[PDB]
Curated annotation (Swiss-Prot), chain A:
This is Nuclear pore complex protein Nup214. The modification Phosphoserine is found at residues 30, 210, 240. The chain holds residues 731 to 972 of 2090 of the full protein. The record marks 82-83 as: Breakpoint. Residues 10-38 are annotated as: Leucine-zipper 1. Homodimer. Part of the nuclear pore complex (NPC). Interacts with NUP88. Interacts with ZFP36; this interaction increases upon lipopolysaccharide (LPS) stimulation. Interacts with DDX19. Interacts with XPO1. Interacts with XPO5. Contains FG repeats. FG repeats are interaction sites for karyopherins (importins, exportins) and form probably an affinity gradient, guiding the transport proteins unidirectionally with their cargo through the NPC. FG repeat regions are highly flexible and lack ordered secondary structure. The overall conservation of FG repeats regarding exact sequence, spacing, and repeat unit length is limited. The beta-propeller contains long interblade connector loops, and mediates interaction with DDX19B. Expressed in thymus, spleen, bone marrow, kidney, brain and testis, but hardly in all other tissues or in whole embryos during development. It is found in: Nucleus, Nuclear pore complex. Probably glycosylated as it reacts with wheat germ agglutinin (WGA). Part of the nuclear pore complex. Has a critical role in nucleocytoplasmic transport. May serve as a docking site in the receptor-mediated import of substrates across the nuclear pore complex. It comes from Homo sapiens.
UniProtKB/Swiss-Prot annotation, chain B:
This is Nuclear pore complex protein Nup85. It is found in: Nucleus, Nuclear pore complex; Chromosome, Centromere, Kinetochore; Cytoplasm, Cytoskeleton, Spindle; Cytoplasm. Component of the nuclear pore complex (NPC). Component of the NPC Nup107-160 subcomplex, consisting of at least NUP107, NUP98/Nup96, NUP160, NUP133, NUP85, NUP37, NUP43 and SEC13. Interacts with NUP160, NUP133 and SEC13. Interacts with NUP37, NUP107 and NUP43. Interacts with CCR2. Essential component of the nuclear pore complex (NPC) that seems to be required for NPC assembly and maintenance. As part of the NPC Nup107-160 subcomplex plays a role in RNA export and in tethering NUP96/Nup98 and NUP153 to the nucleus. The Nup107-160 complex seems to be required for spindle assembly during mitosis. NUP85 is required for membrane clustering of CCL2-activated CCR2. Seems to be involved in CCR2-mediated chemotaxis of monocytes and may link activated CCR2 to the phosphatidyl-inositol 3-kinase-Rac-lammellipodium protrusion cascade. Involved in nephrogenesis. It comes from Homo sapiens (Human).
UniProtKB/Swiss-Prot annotation, chain C:
One of its GO terms (molecular function) is structural constituent of nuclear pore. The keyword Secreted does not apply. This is Nuclear pore complex protein Nup88. It comes from the Eukaryota. The modification Phosphoserine is found at residues 29, 44, 373, 431, 436, 511, 534, 692. PANTHER family: NUCLEAR PORE COMPLEX PROTEIN NUP88, NUCLEOPORIN NUP84-RELATED. InterPro entries: Nucleoporin_Nup88 (IPR019321), NUP88/NUP82 (IPR037700). Disulfide bonds: none annotated. The gene is NUP88. Pfam families: Nup88.
From Swiss-Prot, chain D:
Belongs to the nucleoporin NSP1/NUP62 family. This is Nuclear pore glycoprotein p62. The gene is NUP62. Essential component of the nuclear pore complex. The N-terminal is probably involved in nucleocytoplasmic transport. The C-terminal is involved in protein-protein interaction probably via coiled-coil formation, promotes its association with centrosomes and may function in anchorage of p62 to the pore complex. Plays a role in mitotic cell cycle progression by regulating centrosome segregation, centriole maturation and spindle orientation. It might be involved in protein recruitment to the centrosome after nuclear breakdown. It comes from the Eukaryota. Signal peptide: none annotated. The modification Phosphoserine is found at residues 42, 52. It is linked to Infantile striatonigral degeneration: Neurological disorder characterized by symmetrical degeneration of the caudate nucleus, putamen, and occasionally the globus pallidus, with little involvement of the rest of the brain. The clinical features include developmental regression, choreoathetosis, dystonia, spasticity, dysphagia, failure to thrive, nystagmus, optic atrophy, and intellectual disability. The chain holds residues 367 to 418 of 522 of the full protein.
Length: 242, 109, 735, 52
């Protein structure tokens, strides 16, 4: 059909343009969002001309002018004041949160510079105590999800087939002093391999045939004609080339 | 597999054959005839991947499959990686006779 | 791996024990050539030529009986595992009898326990105990050349007293739990069960003759009963069964469990009896029959019945064989209960429910090859002899048949469908219609030793099926002690559907081969279907340097049969293999071209999709800059339509009061930025002054890096399984 | 295996081509509606200029 190489160039050249078709689709979905934004700002524009048109007609009413003393702020002057209030409160909080992070980093610098003056080894334990925590969170969610499956099976909302699950491993020390610990670990292993137990009963009696299935087979077989199944010889020797 | 996304798929077939191998576990209540019959399926499955030429894109992985099948020619092609004859013996027992007895052992040695 | 198979085909027929037994037969032929016949007439018919099996196997060794020395010759099928010596053509052990058997042995049988062998002749039985196994190789007495084996004669005094009694059939009682019991059938129509604890006295005796109430007369009717077929010829056990509750009276709460013994007569009437060696004899072991054979035959299904085999399946299948070469396949079913309607006048109020035999089919064996004689001789004598039936230890839908002129294999294709139907539901009518699709039994003539009428046969003397060391295999040993070996197929393959390849193609979008991806063998199984034979040539035994050279005319008929089977069942089917593989490969040759033409089209659209995306972005930014210019004209108009108000509102003054406050909070806030920046500058300058002694690189060992990578793999894969499981529940519980 | 990928790929080329062509026509509709808006705006810019 082909060589081992032609059938591999078909795979790699497929995967290199599949990668591009995601890259160019992502720009096509991005630009639709920016076009949808622009359609929205275009309707804010259409509203702005009618806002201006009505405002321009109201400005000619000689009865309007005497009410202006009690007017609220206009909805842009109030909004610029709401933003100034929002920005002032942000600039106030962020100055406190930057100062409190900088005090926290400096309490931790004073603590590291304390810790240094009495000797070695914490950095090994943060790694393993985080792996111990992650594996516990894995066992916790796994137990919660299995209880949810139990509840859905009790409710007859989920029926199931069968699935399985994994196991661990560990590596050894190299540098010269644990031989007796591996040999005691192997000797306790071998001692726990050593021999098990026995059983006795009668053979299980084979299942009886349903009396209905048996009566069906009686009546199938009694009506069948039984013409013999011969060893088949070739049905024409009169096609020899001699 | 992390460095080479062209071999990685085949390196993980080799790697998962290196997880289906029936090795004896001391804490495990099986017979020798169970280990033997499971190892015979694993051998018939490893040889199946050699007939379908699965590893003929990297000769190192093609050698590892022959080694894992107990090929005494491919094992002797690895002699520059076998510093002594008794490691060659134990390799040859692992990949050609996992139910070896003391009473057979002189013949292999 | 495959390679170990061919070595044993060439080694084993050339082994020294087959040479010793071929040399001895030349040393028995020199002494009776010459005394001329004077006038007298022996008033006797010749003896009945019985079908031998003087061979068995155990654990991976073959055992050949040697009646010239009174021993078994024991030969090993396990080579020394690896290492590179050849198996020694010279090596074997001799198991010599302690007391020798005082009769001609035609058969040997191993016990259910695998410890005891019966040595079986027309005038006796002797039973040889296997010696203990030990040493480097698990050998008899630790690897001795000759071992003596303890022998016990069975029923000796009953064969040594009554000259007219002969053995017809024998077997082991089917128990691994009890002491070894034999079962005999003798020429007085009685079955006798003997214990090896009490080898001269029968533990149970079963008269097969209906003769109750008339005692006190002798002995001579033995001529006339035999002519009418009223002699029991053979027997076999079905599997352990629960006794039908109507045979005992109404006062037992336990279920009684016995072996069903099926007994065949020469007239072809079958009878049943239920036998236990564990229960009191109270209505156990009455005779039951004759058993009705449906449908009713007008020839009566022959009067030459000679062998019987009770296959271990549910319902039971009983194979009945005849000297004509016919084999009947009787399904055993429990009888009907009669509805009490519409008959008066039956006189006996004791109808025991008797089971019925149902013939599924009959097989007719080619016992010698049929050649083309001319149409006009009404007296061509059909070649008949006693069929011998054998169980297959690896296939419960196959059995095998030995006879004087060859060996036949028979598979029952319908057994798996019978098991499928009985295992389907009480409404599943379709599984009974799958039993009515016409798949006959397959019949294979494996060995022929009478290929021409003018040839004398080579009767089989040894037959055994090896299960575990060569694959499933057959061993046959001729009357000349030539050793012949066929590997058996492990499966009883039924025939496949008629040709998955009269497909005319149809396009739209998807490939026809997506259906053939689901099953891995789909094309290989199609070629294995087209290659399938309905007929072969049998394998032929080489003619002897002592035989008569045949008339040339029959060699031409034998060769004209042979090349035609090759032209019709091999060459044609291998040319159809080729035409199919040609058509398959051509479709793949064009499909890859189509994939390269699809691929290069998508390679051309790659550029056009980019050259469009760039222009769409350049067109969007031009529309965005224009909206922004319109909005900055709008914002300027809305700001000129507000500058013309003649007085400040209360809210424009209360905003000014608030706006005048913020500059003094912005002073304190900007000073707080300066204070925090001078705090950052100070901390950063203070940290920097500490960087000028080294830190020790924390080299994780290349095994501790492996540990952490292995654990991050275990925990990474457990997280995948939890994500999979949550998505699968989310797919199954749609709301 | 190769055919399924190349057929799924051909379907996703044609999808992005259709979606790109749609965005072009939606941009052309925006550019026309921007002209209706800009041509409603100019008559108000003129009225203020006369009133100042």
């Amino acid at each position: 059909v082909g060589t081992s190489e032609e059938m591999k160039m078909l795979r790699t050249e497929s995967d290199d343009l599949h990668t591009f078709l995601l890259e160019i689709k992502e720009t096509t979905e991005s630009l639709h969002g920016d076009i949808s934004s622009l359609k929205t700002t275009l309707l804010e524009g259409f509203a702005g001309v009618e806002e201006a048109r009505e405002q321009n007609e109201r400005n000619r009413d000689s009865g309007y002018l005497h009410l202006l003393y009690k007017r609220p702020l206009d909805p842009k002057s109030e909004a610029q004041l709401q933003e100034i209030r929002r920005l002032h409160q942000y600039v106030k909080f962020a100055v406190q949160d930057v100062n409190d992070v900088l005090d926290l980093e400096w309490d931790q610098h004073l603590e590291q510079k304390k810790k240094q003056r009495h000797l070695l080894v914490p950095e090994r334990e943060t790694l393993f105590n985080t792996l111990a925590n992650n594996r516990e969170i894995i066992n916790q969610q796994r137990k919660r999800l299995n209880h949810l499956v139990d509840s859905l099976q009790q409710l007859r909302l989920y029926k199931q087939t069968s699935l399985w699950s994994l196991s661990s491993a560990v590596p050894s020390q190299s540098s010269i002093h644990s031989f007796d610990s591996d040999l005691e670990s192997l000797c306790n292993a071998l001692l726990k391999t050593t021999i098990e137990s026995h059983t006795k009963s009668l053979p299980k009696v084979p299942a009886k045939l349903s009396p209905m299935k048996q009566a069906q087979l009686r009546n199938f077989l009694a009506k069948r004609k039984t013409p013999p199944v011969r060893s088949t010889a070739p049905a024409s020797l009169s096609r020899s080339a001699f | 597999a992390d460095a080479s996304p062209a071999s990685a798929g085949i390196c993980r077939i080799m790697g998962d054959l290196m997880r289906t191998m029936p090795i004896l576990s001391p804490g495990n209540t099986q017979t020798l005839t169970e280990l033997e019959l499971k190892w015979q399926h694993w051998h018939e499955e490893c040889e199946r991947y050699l007939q379908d030429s699965t590893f003929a894109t990297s000769p190192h992985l093609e050698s590892l499959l022959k080694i894992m099948l107990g090929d005494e020619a491919a094992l002797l092609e690895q002699k520059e990686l076998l510093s002594n004859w008794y490691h060659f013996l134990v390799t040859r027992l692992l990949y050609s006779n996992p139910t070896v007895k003391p009473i057979d052992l002189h013949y292999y040695a | 791996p495959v390679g170990d198979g061919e070595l044993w085909q060439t080694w084993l027929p050339n082994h020294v024990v087959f040479l010793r037994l071929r040399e001895g037969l030349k040393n028995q032929s020199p002494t009776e050539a010459e005394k001329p016949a004077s006038s007298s007439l022996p008033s006797s018919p010749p003896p009945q030529l019985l079908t031998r099996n003087v061979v068995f196997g155990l654990g991976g060794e073959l055992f050949l009986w040697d009646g010239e020395d009174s021993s078994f010759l024991v030969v090993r099928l396990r080579g020394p595992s690896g290492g590179g010596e050849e198996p020694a053509l010279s090596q074997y052990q001799r198991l010599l009898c302690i007391n020798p058997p005082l009769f001609e042995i035609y058969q040997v049988l191993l016990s259910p326990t695998q410890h005891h062998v019966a040595l079986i002749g027309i005038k006796g039985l002797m039973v040889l105990e296997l010696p203990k196994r030990w040493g480097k190789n698990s050998e008899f007495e630790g690897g001795k050349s000759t071992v003596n084996c303890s022998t016990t004669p069975v029923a000796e005094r009953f064969f040594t007293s009554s000259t007219s009694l002969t053995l017809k059939h024998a077997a082991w009682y089917p128990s691994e739990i009890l002491d070894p019991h034999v079962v005999l059938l003798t020429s007085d129509n009685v079955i006798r069960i003997y214990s090896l604890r009490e080898p001269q006295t029968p533990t149970n005796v079963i008269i097969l003759s209906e003769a109750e109430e008339e005692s006190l007369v002798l002995n001579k009717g033995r001529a006339y009963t035999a002519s009418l077929g009223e002699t029991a010829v053979a027997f076999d056990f079905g599997p352990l069964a629960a006794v039908p509750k109507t045979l005992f009276g109404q006062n037992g709460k336990d279920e009684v469990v016995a072996y069903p013994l099926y007994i065949l007569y020469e007239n072809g009437e079958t009878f049943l009896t239920y036998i236990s060696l564990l229960h009191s004899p109270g209505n156990i072991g009455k005779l039951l029959g004759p058993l009705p054979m449906h449908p009713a035959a007008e020839d009566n299904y022959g009067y030459d019945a000679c062998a019987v085999l009770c296959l271990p399946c549910v319902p039971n299948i009983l194979v009945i064989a005849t000297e004509s070469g016919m084999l009947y396949h009787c399904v055993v079913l429990e009888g009907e209960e009669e509805d009490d309607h519409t008959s008066e006048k039956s006189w006996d109020s004791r109808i025991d429910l008797i089971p019925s035999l149902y013939v599924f089919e009959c097989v007719e064996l080619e016992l010698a090859l049929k050649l083309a004689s001319g149409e006009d001789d009404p007296f061509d004598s059909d070649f008949s002899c006693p069929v011998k039936l054998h169980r297959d230890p690896k296939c419960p839908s196959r059995y095998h048949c030995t006879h004087e002129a060859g060996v036949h294999s028979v598979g029952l294709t319908w057994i798996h469908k019978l098991h499928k139907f009985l295992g389907s539901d009480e409404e599943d009518k379709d599984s009974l219609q799958e039993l009515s699709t016409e798949q006959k039994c397959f019949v294979e003539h494996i060995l022929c030793t009478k290929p021409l009428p003018c040839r004398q046969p080579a009767p089989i003397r040894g037959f055994w099926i090896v299960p575990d060391i060569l694959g499933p295999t057959m061993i046959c040993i001729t009357s000349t002690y030539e050793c012949l070996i066929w590997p058996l197929l492990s499966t009883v393959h039924p025939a496949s559907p008629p040709l998955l390849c009269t497909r005319e193609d149809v396009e739209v979008a998807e490939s026809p081969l997506r259906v053939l991806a689901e099953t891995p063998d789909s094309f290989e199984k199609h070629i294995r279907s087209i290659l399938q034979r309905s007929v072969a040539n049998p394998a032929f035994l080489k003619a002897s340097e002592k035989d008569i050279a045949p008339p040339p005319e029959e060699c031409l008929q034998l060769l004209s049969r042979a090349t035609q089977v090759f032209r019709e069942q091999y060459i044609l089917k291998q040319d159809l293999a080729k035409e199919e593989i040609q058509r398959r490969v051509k479709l793949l040759c064009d499909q890859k071209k189509k994939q390269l033409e699809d691929l290069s089209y998508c390679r051309e659209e790659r550029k056009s999709l980019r050259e469009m995306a760039e222009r769409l972005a350049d067109k969007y930014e031009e529309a965005k800059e224009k909206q922004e210019d319109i909005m900055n004209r709008m914002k300027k108009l809305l700001h000129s339509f507000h500058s013309e108000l003649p007085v400040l509102s209360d809210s424009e003054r209360d905003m000014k009061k608030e706006l005048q406050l913020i500059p003094d909070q912005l002073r304190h806030l900007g000073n707080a930025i300066k204070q925090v920046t001078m705090k950052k500058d100070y901390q950063q300058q203070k940290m920097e002054k500490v960087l000028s002694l080294p830190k020790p690189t924390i080299i994780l060992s290349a095994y501790q890096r492996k540990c952490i990578q292995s654990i991050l793999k275990e925990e990474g894969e457990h997280i995948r399984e939890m994500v999979k499981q949550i998505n699968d529940i989310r797919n199954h519980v749609n709301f | 295996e190769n055919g399924e990928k190349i057929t799924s790929l051909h379907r996703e080329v044609e999808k992005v081509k259709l979606d790109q062509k749609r965005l072009d026509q939606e941009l052309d509709f925006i550019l026309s509606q921007q002209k209706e808006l800009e041509d409603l705006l100019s008559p108000l810019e003129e009225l203020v200029k006369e009133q100042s």
